[PDB]
Design a protein around this ligand. Sequence first.
Ligand SMILES: [Zn+2]
Length: 567
Amino acid sequence: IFTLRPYQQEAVDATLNHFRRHKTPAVIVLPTGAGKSLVIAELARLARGRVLVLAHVKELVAQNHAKYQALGLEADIFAAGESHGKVVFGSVQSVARNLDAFQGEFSLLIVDECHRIGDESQYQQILTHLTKVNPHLRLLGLTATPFRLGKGWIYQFHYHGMVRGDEKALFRDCIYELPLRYMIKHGYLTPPERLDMPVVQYDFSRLQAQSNGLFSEADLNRELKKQQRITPHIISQIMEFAATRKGVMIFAATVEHAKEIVGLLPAEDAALITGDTPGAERDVLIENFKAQRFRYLVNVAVLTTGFDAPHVDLIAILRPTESVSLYQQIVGRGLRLAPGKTDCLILDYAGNPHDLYAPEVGTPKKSDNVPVQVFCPACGFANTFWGKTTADGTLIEHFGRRCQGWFEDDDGHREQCDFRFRFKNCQCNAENDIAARRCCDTVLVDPDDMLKAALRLKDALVLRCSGMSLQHGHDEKGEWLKITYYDEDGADVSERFRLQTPAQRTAFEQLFIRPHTRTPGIPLRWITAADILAQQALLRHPDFVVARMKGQYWQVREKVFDYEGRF
Ligand SMILES: [Zn+2]
């Protein structure tokens, strides 16, 4: 009935194949402005009952209903003001109060912007009702933001073979991803154009990332009072560029910062959407934007927009983007196609990096860590961890702990690879409480309790390691290496490894290189102790060392790497 672009047809066939094999929810990740209409339309033409396309934000419900009807097709909509024509568009709130109009056959429920499912209960009543009437209802998610630092991933298994979320994830599966790179290369989105060399810039290279990878509004604002002589320099330039631009989106750091940005722009050539703005004015600014009444839209929570207006051609980033995902999401808000649009201008006034095409690690950043690719010695899967690569381009250090690949067997059994880059014992994860299977389902002993126990023996030494030093020598049975661990206040303890026999070399790889290496999975290459001595920028020292007394000298019995306590 309709002609689909190839990526749309792949989205459809992905969905159909999945639900032909599986009952479980699945999500699809197409970028913003991908043309969902045809995906929904063809799935609906194939659907047996009716199809419910749900969304939490009214403006999106209306835009989806509109783009679908412009196909020459008919749909009902439920928001705040016809004929069941086999697709129904609805808001979460409007649907949870009209269930008796949704009691016929529904085969599929598409949730647009499904990352919003997390942020509550009206939606779950909706889903309890549809699953009550339709036990085999199939649920499909659409999102441009499957990940947010602080919230993790919307799904667990990616169909390319990488695990993202855990068992707690909402969608078990992501069954198709449309990459921004492909949309841009094939003119499916507006090509972006970022100005390499700007006027003055912010310097947020001084703030502390929190636990969840995000900075804080208080930490953002303190720093934004010491650079707030620089702020009108930006807006001025922003204003300059907006002479030959139609719509301009400013991404501010905090609520207070946003009001500043607004108070430096032409009075009501600019508007301000904050997380706490009435939805009588937020929607009036919605409609005044879209229309080109004002020129500047100042926002603060991003991922709070349907104001992706097609006419928008200037994105102003005045805030450091913690995840590359946040960066692509913000830029993408101005990449929709529009008549006359040749490019979208990207002005970033923080110290953000460039690649729209960057692999999203999925866990928080040291500030200076870049993605690194690491192959799994077990399954071969190309992994994306945080690391430091050298000027040339090879690995100084990487920070991953487990292979993220997964695989499916004959009998439908799906397993994540067990290879561990950082292990703990005879080899559950660095933060395992109980062994899966050895010292044996035993309770593992928390490094902190161990530390305190060793401090409660005055026959044991406990060094808070701050460095180590290597030395080698030989005698009638071969070479040997001697490592010496020291306190930042004097104390020594040392161990020594013969390197002569093959069993010696093997023990030394097991017990020294594999715990001490900075690039686990990539083998250190050595023939004698001099090669080890030459490479100790690839080796790390333990955070703690526990020695005991043999007879008359201290003997190492424990090292604690990758520490995470208060001791
Ligand atoms: Zn693996």
